[PDB]
Every structure is written in structure tokens, then in C-alpha cells.
Design a protein around this ligand. Structure first.
Ligand SMILES: CC(C)=CCC/C(C)=C/CSP(=O)(O)OP(=O)(O)O
Ligand SMILES: O=C1C(O)=CC(=O)c2c(O)cc(O)cc21
Ligand SMILES: [Mg+2]
Length: 301
């Protein structure tokens, strides 16, 4: 429906406007049109995310895509929206759906850059482990090379994976995390092994509240690029930052970002990302939600 495309895009501009970011329609409209059938409210998920520091001048969007519509990356490449990297990443999404059960897909882009990634959701009652994932031919070798470490910290079940075709990186979204894993002692030990920024008390408190944790890996080396802790909540003041600027900006976004599910509070997903020399903050304000998010809020918020 051409109507849904316009509705979604307008909302995207609205979310971007709050951050002072302009949307490149030539890069966005073509993509929304291609997946116009998924933009229908009901069982669709759409998120508009902001980030601090370096990525403060950008705005990302995530749109769920049912598997019934077919491999999303095969679609964008075939439609000439994105060029094949020529690397294993081009086959990872196809191989994943070829080796494991995928319950849903998702496309991810940036308002000025365009399409950049896809997601592969697995059945909650049948999520793969690190072993099954590392077996995928096109999966980064780093996944297998970090299997022991993951097990040592209770990172086993993965609710989904994402592929960034531009940076050639893979995220593993671990789920069903144990309290032990999120303990301050466990978190510090983990970050130290990965050589990442050491979170302070505020950061540690956020980690403990996390419902999901995801490391980013690459095909070049076996070193994890970064690790992100995600918290889902209806609370608009959870940004784990001591910066007056972040406190104000994230709160503004969390209370004004567009959303269609009027009748309920805005679903928000905050992220604390730790990189080798620093940490930055993220916040996804959901424009479309489903029972999945509703269930997560009841369980972790
Ligand atoms: C349910 C849907 C459509 C997906 C939401 C997207 C999601 C889980 C956010 C992770 S992405 P992100 O936090 O931006 O981190 P990076 O790709 O930069 O590593
Ligand atoms: O945003 C969601 C989301 O909307 C639903 C999820 O199940 C999920 C997950 O398992 C892990 C994540 O890092 C994020 C999410
Ligand atoms: Mg993003």
C-alpha cells in the first residue's frame, strides 16, 4: 500500500527531525517501496534509533520482514539497491536460513546512508547455540574461536543474528541471560578478556538490567569489535550516561519519537556499547510493536 510507505517515511522524517538529521529520500523511498507489504501495522516491528557521540549525526531504522517475503538481501541486491560485497557476508543470511530455522527477517538502514544490514530471527522455543551458529559455512571464524569464552560467561542461546554488509560485521544477540552473567564481577571479567572499555557503576547497573547482550565480530580477526548491553523499558530516563547533554537529548527523543500504537506507552530499547577505547549510548524508539515486545516488557521491565 502506497499509503503505508508515505506514513512510515513521514514518521521517519519526524524521528530524524528531532535529532536534526535530514533523510535522503532517494535512498529511503526505494527501499520502503520494495518492502511496502511489511509496513502494514499489526505484526510488524519498526524501530527508529539514535546514538551518542560519533553516530549522533545519524538515524537508523529497522523494519521486520516475514520470511514469507523471501531473503531480504537477495531482494535488495537483485533490485540493484545494494552491490554484493563479494565477501562471505553476502551468503551468510542465505546460509543461515539454509542451516537453521528462521522465524522472521529484518532490514536495517540509515536515513542518509540507505540499506546496510539484515537480521535473522530464530524461534524462541528453538534458538540455536554458539555451536550450531559457528557451523554455518559463511559465518565468521571468530564465532567458533570465541565459543569457549562465550560458554564461560553463560552466553549460549541466541535469539537472532544481524549482518552489516558495509562494515562486514556480525552481531550475536544472546538471550535467556542468567543473573550470574550480568553480575558486576562477571561483566568486568568479560570486558577485560575482550579488551573493552571498563563500565563504571552507572554502566554496571544498566548491564545488570539487560535482557540482551550482543558482541560484534568480523571475518578479519578473531577479536570482538565491541559488546552491547540492551535494556527494554517504557521508562524514558534510562540512558546510562553522566553527560548532561545525553541525559536531556535521550529523554527528549524517548518522549517525542513517533509511534502508531497510541493507547500504550512508547516501547524503548536502550543500548550501552563498549568498544576498545570508549563507550557510547543508543536508544531505539519503536514505531511499531508486536506481542513480542509486550512480553519482553512484562518480563524485564
Ligand atoms: C525487531 C527489529 C526489526 C530489530 C531491532 C534492531 C536491533 C535488535 C538493534 C541492534 S542494532 P545496533 O544496536 O544499531 O548495533 P550495531 O548494528 O551498530 O552493531
Ligand atoms: O529489540 C528487540 C526486540 O524487539 C525483540 C527481541 O526479541 C530482541 C532480542 O532477543 C535481543 C535484542 O538485542 C533486541 C530485541
Ligand atoms: Mg543501528
Amino acid at each position: 500500500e502506497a499509503a503505508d510507505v508515505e506514513r512510515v517515511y513521514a514518521a521517519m522524517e519526524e524521528a530524524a527531525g528531532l535529532l536534526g538529521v535530514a533523510c535522503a529520500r532517494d535512498k529511503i523511498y526505494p527501499l520502503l517501496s520494495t518492502f511496502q507489504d511489511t509496513l502494514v501495522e499489526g505484526g510488524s516491528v519498526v524501530v527508529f534509533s539514535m546514538a551518542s557521540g560519533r553516530h549522533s549525526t545519524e538515524l537508523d531504522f529497522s523494519i521486520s520482514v516475514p520470511t514469507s517475503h523471501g531473503d531480504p538481501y537477495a531482494t535488495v541486491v537483485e533490485k540493484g539497491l545494494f552491490p554484493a560485497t563479494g565477501h562471505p557476508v553476502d551468503d551468510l543470511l542465505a546460509d543461515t536460513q539454509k542451516h537453521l530455522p528462521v522465524s522472521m527477517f529484518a532490514i536495517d538502514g540509515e536515513v542518509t546512508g540507505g540499506f546496510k544490514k539484515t537480521y535473522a530471527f530464530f524461534p524462541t522455543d528453538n534458538m540455536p547455540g554458539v555451536a550450531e551458529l559457528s557451523a554455518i559455512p559463511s559465518m565468521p571464524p571468530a564465532v567458533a574461536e570465541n565459543a569457549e569464552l562465550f560458554a564461560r560467561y553463560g552466553l549460549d542461546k541466541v535469539q537472532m543474528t544481524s549482518m552489516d554488509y558495509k562494515k562486514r560485521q556480525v552481531n550475536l544477540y544472546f538471550s535467556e541471560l542468567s543473573a550470574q552473567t550480568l553480575e558486576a564481577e562477571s561483566v568486568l571479567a568479560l570486558v577485560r578478556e575482550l579488551g573493552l572499555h571498563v563500565p563504571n557503576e552507572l554502566g554496571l547497573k544498566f548491564c545488570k538490567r539487560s535482557f540482551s547482550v550482543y558482541p560484534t565480530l568480523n571475518w578479519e580477526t578473531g577479536k570482538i569489535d565491541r559488546l552491547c548491553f540492551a535494556v527494554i523499558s517504557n521508562d524514558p530516563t534510562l540512558v546510562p550516561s553522566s553527560d548532561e547533554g545525553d541525559i536531556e537529548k535521550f529523554h527528549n527523543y524517548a518522549t517525542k519519537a513517533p509511534y502508531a500504537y497510541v493507547g500504550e506507552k512508547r516501547t524503548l530499547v536502550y543500548g550501552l556499547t563498549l568498544s576498545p577505547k570508549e563507550e557510547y549510548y543508543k536508544l531505539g524508539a519503536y514505531y511499531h510493536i508486536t506481542d513480542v515486545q509486550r512480553g519482553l516488557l512484562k518480563a524485564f521491565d
